[PDB]
Write an enzyme that holds these catalytic residues in place. Structure first.
Site, short mmCIF file in Angstrom:
data_model
loop_
_atom_site.label_atom_id
_atom_site.label_comp_id
_atom_site.label_asym_id
_atom_site.label_seq_id
_atom_site.Cartn_x
_atom_site.Cartn_y
_atom_site.Cartn_z
N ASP A 50 -22.39 45.04 54.38
CA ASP A 50 -21.13 45.70 54.66
C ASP A 50 -21.27 47.19 54.33
O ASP A 50 -22.22 47.60 53.65
CB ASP A 50 -20.03 45.04 53.83
CG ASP A 50 -18.70 45.77 53.92
OD1 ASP A 50 -18.17 45.93 55.05
OD2 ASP A 50 -18.18 46.15 52.86
N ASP A 52 -18.10 49.75 53.79
CA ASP A 52 -17.07 50.32 52.93
C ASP A 52 -16.95 49.58 51.60
O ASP A 52 -16.73 48.36 51.57
CB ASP A 52 -15.74 50.34 53.65
CG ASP A 52 -15.63 51.51 54.62
OD1 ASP A 52 -16.28 52.53 54.37
OD2 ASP A 52 -14.91 51.40 55.63
MG LIG Z 1 -16.21 46.55 52.45
#
Ligand SMILES: [Mg+2]
Ligand SMILES: [Mg+2]
Ligand SMILES: [Mg+2]
Ligand SMILES: [Mg+2]
Lengths: 472, 472, 472, 472
Positions: A50, A52
């Site tokens: 991922d 963020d």
């Molecule tokens: Mg995230």
């Protein structure tokens, strides 16, 4: 000193790849990978990420304040009262993973079974007996997602505080009359639930149509943690396996953030040529729409990387050098990279959307990033005397009313060390919902994914075998 | 010697209420109440009971054989082939809690994450590599309830064996051609899924429209465990709190079974007058429809106890002496008995319908009855050398191919001690789905609810506090 | 000469309220109110209005061209090919009420039973035999709303033509390969269904986030029909009953359009003071969300008319002078105006959202505005010889192959008089779906709501009684 | 003299196939096929049939009384009061197609738009003003199938009367207290809706688990109309096309009823050898589950005709001589018989399940059997003076209070000629919902399918072209 300050301190340190120094670095809890279920790293063929709050950790409290301020302004621009503009984000109030009860307007901290650990109406903390009027069994059915909203991500920290602010404001402003389920001002009734929805709407708007992204990208050093050790870890992962990115963000924001994260005058280590961030990934996928991504997903599209727009139509071709995907599903990654779920270590911060759902729906191995664990660890060691003490009182109690009131006294004193809503992981001796989901679905977890750098890449992460009570 | 033989042995023993003898009786694991989460018995105001396989434990293997035989006959009467009549129930094959995969026709034993522990197609046990053709990640999504059926109750033991029988029969009968998803015989295609549905249909039919109940009630001593200590425990529960029955069975079957369970020439203890079974309950509720009972429930009705039929209309009156309820919901019990969920200890055998759902939806305290634990305990102590050994090999391995093959060798030898499908709780060092749900949702558990008799009624059942890895 | 040219001609005529002149004016079909079911105007207590294409009739083809051009530009800006910019709106192609088949990419004109009357793939009209490959029974199930989209409103005229344009373009551009269900260009596959969705998306976007409204309001005389007789009719309606506005548009657009519609140097008639448009309405409701409005509706809100924003909260007060509502439901209107459904004549142009749904869900009386009826009437009289002829051939046929081919010949010649997709109401002797829904759900209908001005306000609109075949 | 008496009279008449006699026989309305939409019989390739109340017309009122009596007894056996046993079926009360309102317990006769034509609470007919308390707009939303049940079939005639009986009984028995939505007797509340559900349940039970079928088959001459002209019509249909049976009934009941319907000492005409009923059908399909049959249907099974049980598995073979199907879908028939929908004339009595759904979902041609039309025609001619009169008063009214009250007077006198609930097709000058659905979905209709025998098999059934008001 915030949790992102700890992470930024570790990030400024260059890597010493001396094997003895590496072993002694994962000495300290701050740099350790913690193990819920054993994982043999040589069996991992694909490392997935991922972006963020995983690769790109936003600095605290600057970024939460920015989101809080833009959310308040959006609410005022659609007609909420001017007094909202005098609110200011306060990082000592919100703990992540609280439940907002849209019926009664309370923030709740609950355990895995939905028992109340803390109840706050505005800034007013309701103690046990008074909570029984609204919660007769001191319990909520967490899965009633129409009434209860779980504030699971670090993106939800500003609205956690804002919800408390608003409830406090309307409760104490004499223009409004409080009712059980909301506030009335003459012929307008605002329920806590519609108030809640306006806050969610405004947060979404600020991220997607407002100016949050622009203001982030205009001052990345103020808002985003940068670590020269990230290129190094990714290039080492590529030596033993494949590396992919699967992020919900769009391509243009992803390119701006990732470019910054690799913006060093060198590549993986000092002295090497710098390389574009895309060269570190065998597969890049944006607009993932997780958790739907781990079920039916969406139509596989192809990004036009020159324009940042999607090409028209569904992409039916093979994996090829330079291609950037949009949408698709977790099966896209398995097919294109030739992987089975247990070959994959997915690394993210969303306990539901990244970790729970990839584990339950697909059998992926999971690594949960918990940015606050940096500070939580500091508090936990520093004031271990309080907890160690608390442990002993419950054993004294096992073998009376005078004991219980000091149980509640040190629970309070322990919890206040973390913030007004206490530790992310517990209230006194009671574990939170969030802690229990970490243990159940996150095979590995750590303050930062970077802690994997301090482990040889054949390392067997080991957890103890679980025994039922009758098997002991 | 079956698990119901152990329970029937303990049932023939009269109660010695000498406090020293009581403490020394819960010495033995067979008579102990095991604790997953601490429970203070003085805080329990209401004790609630299921009937079938809780108060009324059916003798094994006689009762499973009866159900198997009547199910086979029903299948033959609707047109399954005559060779089915030569099947005979074999208690050493089925373990409870297996998953039938209606797509490929396999019985599977899985862990909490849906990883395959055992795979059997008919009586043919598929080993690791061959399972990958059908299960590429050696994993199933348990929540895909359209494909997978979990055989959770002791009522499902006969159909567990019958499914294996049928798959084995059609696989090896030359009139039929096997395909991936079923069997073809000329112009008729029978999928494993429609085969599965006919088996479920026939089991339901036998219980509800066939002759199973009649044949049970005609020879209760052959089929039902009887224990003179049951009146004693219930009357002691009534001294400190309220007692209720909430069962899915109808009133006429309930009255026949319960009358038998209290059919002694005395009441709670020898020498006392006998009392009707209904006098031991403050609230009696039949046709409960659990787990729906723990949500919206159904309309509250009133039983006409002279005729066994429901009175016409919804019952809107108060709790009154002699009344018997039908339907309603868990809220009926809380209102009528003046209880909150955490005041209630609900005692049942259905891990989903009795325990999981009352805990998650209502915050009830839970006590899970596991009748097979009698025998499982015997095997676990007797052959603890095998497990103790296995524990050490995984630690030897932690600090190579020659080790792993003996890991698999003793896993097999340990598991065979329980039956062809292994222990209810584990396969080697891997816990089953069922074991993990026991630990997560059953606050207390025991081979029999009667084990509560050996504990003073202020007893604090104690479990150790849980710590996350980073908190250690 | 377009249909809006006829309406603009009638609009420039001042009202002669001489009763003899009024009766002689509803002489001409252009000015008549047509009757499907009898309606006694003295029983009507409330007259309700839609705005767009009812009170505010957009000039044709200028407004359709504007929408077409902005939709094309939006498609090009998200990545459709540049050649789209050379398209130009052509009003002779689209007829309203066609069905787009997202599977095969055809525009279809169907009857009430879903039988094919016309089939066009791009600009290629498929005749009977070739349609059987894709439609074996020459029939579609209209209610399969996942496959078929009915283009019911005058807002859909630009996308009706645009869909044909696109299919034609991709069919004949050599960069693309046509398949049964879409077009492929190397590794990108564009299905007709995703192509369709992009067109709907772009039309929505242009109305709600693009510049269509701005460009309309910047040149209202170019785009909107204005009629000095509208204030007169509304003020006469207010003399016998109540008048309300219920429109899906927002308050700011509504205020701009309505202000223009009343922008005359006089009020109801020449010589009277001008009055704001709001003074003609007892109830004003925007953001109606019809047809949902006729079921559960949405939360009743109150517009802040100084800012054009909604006040925060649900409006719980009474009807009061000056108030403007947002949302709510049809029950809001009945309560606030003290009306039952059959007291209400609702006047709109949306055959589904305004007429069908208010009739079926609420029993409202209905008046359907059909702006194209102006021109359709002209064609129908002018070339009545063709239809009159066609009528006679089917009777000659009733009492052979040489006849049928001239049946198809004059059907074609009759239909071409209307446009390439024929009359809104029929193809030859076969009525369209749209015509049948007009007859079934529109109690009254007319080229313009203004035709009500030529009827005394006690007038009994009379339709003939319907007789079943066996009752004749 | 009942409607089945007329049909039985026509059935006893032998066929005179003299073409002049045939034309003069369809002279009389009783023997005519009525036409809603034109149908060219030479284009019909397949004739399909329903069985119950189509091929097998149950004698009235004997069969309704039998169903009424067995339904009452079932209700009493589950606990309804004994006074129910003194009810007796009364054929002059119920008209088919009434709506039961489960909220208020009324039987309603409505038009196509849900306007109230008759309202009866028990045997008490509510006139206009008093209905407004419960129906403020004198209107119901017919599609609210949770509240309203439409009694569409002749099977529903007994429960139509029984519902009225029950409401009347509880209203006037002093043991019960009437409320708006039901009846209370002390602590039991019986809502009209649960009362309604018990009646539906009991009717289903009597047909499927009770003794209705057995008692029918034990005295077929008492209960079933028999007509020697049925073999003749079927054999003539087979000369020009294919013939199929698609019935919801099971194979054993179908075989008993059909055998009786063909039980003559001859085949198609006197003098010919008798042939089994199955030889008249190219395709026989039972357990059709219409209307689901016209969508996804169910799994295609094959009947074992020796045992009456289904063979195990899905039938995947071809159509073959002797085979009998169970389940499947309408596509089964199209594939196996090589037909498109418009090639098929489906003949049935269920306005929803046979006619509406085959037309709308599949484009089949439709022939609706209306057994009561025999008597309705008699009443309509005999008392045409009343209707002819009524027609003239509405025209006198068009060109006052004294007129309206005689409008209501002759409406009443006309309606009473049919029964207490009036004609199936109208109340005065207002057509019923049922009449409007006949006109809309039944291409042809008749008192009996046998009326097709009096038409040459190239006959063009002709209906007049429909014109919109503005096209006249
Ligand atoms: Mg995230
Ligand atoms: Mg049980
Ligand atoms: Mg409009
Ligand atoms: Mg029928």
């Amino acid at each position: 000193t915030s949790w992102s300050d700890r992470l930024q301190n570790a990030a400024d340190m260059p890597a010493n790849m001396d094997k003895h120094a590496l072993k002694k670095y994962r000495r300290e809890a701050y740099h350790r990978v913690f193990v819920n279920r054993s994982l043999a790293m040589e069996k991992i063929k694909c490392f997935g990420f991922d972006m963020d709050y995983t690769l790109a950790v936003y600095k605290s409290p600057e970024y939460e304040s920015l989101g809080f301020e833009l959310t308040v302004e959006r609410l005022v621009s659609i007609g909420y009262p001017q007094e909202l503009l005098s609110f200011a984000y306060d990082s000592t109030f919100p703990t992540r993973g609280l439940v907002f009860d849209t019926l009664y307007g309370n923030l709740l901290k609950v355990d895995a079974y939905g028992n109340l650990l803390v109840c706050a109406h505005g800034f007013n903390f309701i103690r046990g007996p008074e909570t029984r009027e609204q919660y007769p069994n001191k319990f909520i059915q967490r899965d009633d997602t129409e009434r209860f909203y779980i504030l699971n991500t670090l993106f939800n920290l500003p609205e956690t505080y804002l919800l408390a602010c608003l409830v406090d404001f309307f409760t104490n402003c004499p223009r409004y009359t409080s009712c059980e389920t909301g506030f009335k001002d003459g012929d307008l009734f605002m329920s806590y639930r519609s108030m809640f929805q306006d806050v969610r709407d405004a947060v979404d708007w600020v991220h997607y149509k407002g100016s949050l992204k622009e203001k982030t990208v205009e001052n990345l050093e103020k808002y985003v943690v940068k670590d020269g050790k990230l290129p190094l870890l990714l290039s080492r992962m590529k030596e033993v396996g494949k590396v992919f990115l699967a992020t919900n963000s769009d391509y243009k924001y992803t390119d701006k953030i990732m470019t910054y994260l690799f913006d060093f005058p060198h590549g993986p280590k000092p002295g090497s040529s710098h390389r574009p961030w895309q060269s570190y990934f065998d597969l890049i996928l944006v607009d993932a729409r997780k958790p739907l991504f781990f079920g039916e997903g969406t139509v596989l599209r192809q990004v036009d990387t020159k324009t940042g727009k999607l090409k028209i139509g569904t992409y039916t071709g093979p994996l090829q050098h330079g291609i950037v995907y949009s949408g698709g599903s977790s099966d896209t990654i398995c097919d294109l990279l030739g992987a089975k779920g247990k070959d994959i270590l997915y690394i993210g911060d969303h306990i539901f959307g990244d970790i729970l759902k990839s584990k339950k729906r697909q059998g992926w191995r999971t690594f949960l990033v918990i940015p606050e664990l940096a500070q939580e660890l500091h508090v936990w060691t520093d004031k271990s005397s309080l907890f160690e003490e608390l442990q002993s009182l419950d054993i004294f109690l096992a073998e009376i009313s005078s004991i219980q009131r000091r149980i509640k006294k040190v629970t309070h004193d322990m919890d206040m060390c973390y913030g007004m809503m206490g530790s992310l992981f517990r209230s006194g001796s009671r574990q939170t919902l969030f802690a229990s989901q970490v243990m159940r679905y996150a095979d590995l977890y750590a303050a930062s994914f970077i802690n994997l750098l301090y482990y040889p890449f054949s390392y067997l992460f080991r957890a103890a075998h679980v025994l039922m009570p009758h098997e002991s």
